[PDB]
């Protein structure tokens, strides 16, 4: 299982790589690679539909908006102190302490867990979304309404 | 103006919107009114399988 574990571990490398580079274009390219690789990681767990939702939303829709904003707003200033000012050593120390050594992990006292693949059922998801969590579904619709109206009101004229 | 004049001017000036609303309304109305009037209406495993075989064997 070398390639599967390597594909899992690649996501953290791409997460660091998004912020490490000085080119905003390359940051977005790293993010697109990360979301494709994570969609393939989620399908190791047995999720077919939700991995496709990950791909379709984040890579298909949101990264296009990122690339339009970057390509419209970024005159090259990588020399203009993006290289000449460097980075913060305190922030790098915080990242090392919290994410490499992981002094406060999410599993807490536990250190070993057995990964278990699932079997996604979209009938169960449809039943849950439209019967058991229907109020949350409608409130998600209201949040999307806030996004649509708010963007169209905030569009620069 | 009445229903007819306003409807004809609306469908002449913008037909796709009017037809879209009509298709949506036909679906909503069929599920609300038309469907529940005409089309709407412990045995063991052995009786269920016997019924399945009986439905299969004539055709």
């Amino acid at each position: 299982m070398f390639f599967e574990n390597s594909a899992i571990l690649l996501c953290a490398l791409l997460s660091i790589a998004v912020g490490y580079t000085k080119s905003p274009f390359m940051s977005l390219m790293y993010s697109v690679m990360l979301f494709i690789n994570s969609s393939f990681v989620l399908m190791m767990l047995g999720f077919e539909f939700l991995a496709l939702v990950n791909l379709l939303v984040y890579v298909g829709a949101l990264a296009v908006l990122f690339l339009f904003v970057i390509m419209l707003l970024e005159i090259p200033a990588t020399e203009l102190r993006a290289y000449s000012r460097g980075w913060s050593t305190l922030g790098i120390f915080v990242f090392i302490i919290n994410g490499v050594f992981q002094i406060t992990p999410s599993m807490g006292p536990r250190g070993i867990i057995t990964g278990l693949p699932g079997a996604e059922s979209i009938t169960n998801l449809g039943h849950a979304l439209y019967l058991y969590f229907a109020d949350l579904l409608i409130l998600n619709s209201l949040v999307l309404t806030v996004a649509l109206f708010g963007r169209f009101a905030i569009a620069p004229v | 103006m009445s229903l007819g004049e306003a409807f004809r001017t609306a469908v002449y000036k913008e037909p796709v919107m009017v037809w879209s609303l009509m298709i949506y309304g036909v679906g909503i109305s069929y599920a609300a009114f038309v469907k529940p009037s005409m089309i709407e209406p412990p045995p063991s495993l052995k009786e269920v399988m016997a019924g399945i075989q009986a439905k299969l064997n004539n055709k």
Partner: protein
Amino acid sequence: TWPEPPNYYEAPKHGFKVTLENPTFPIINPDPNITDAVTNMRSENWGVVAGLAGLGYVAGYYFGAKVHWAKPTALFTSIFLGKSGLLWGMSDSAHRLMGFKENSKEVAANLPHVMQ
């Protein structure tokens, strides 16, 4: 281990808000439809519907007259408050029919062959 064979064609009968009560009154209909809810509604419910509609008409006429649009504002505000009152009244009638509220008036009217 071996899972249950799934029944794709049967959906669970579940409403998203669960009442967590047993009814404390006699049950006429455990699941009334909208016709059942309207046909056993009391007169106080219709009275509060008409009161809400009248208050809505008057207030909409007042507020819509500042932009010279008083009649459609009055009509819209009347319908808006009236449907709020109608939903309240239908819910009250359905709860009396299901047994969660007092239904002595409803038991002596909704069971023509089970009157006494």
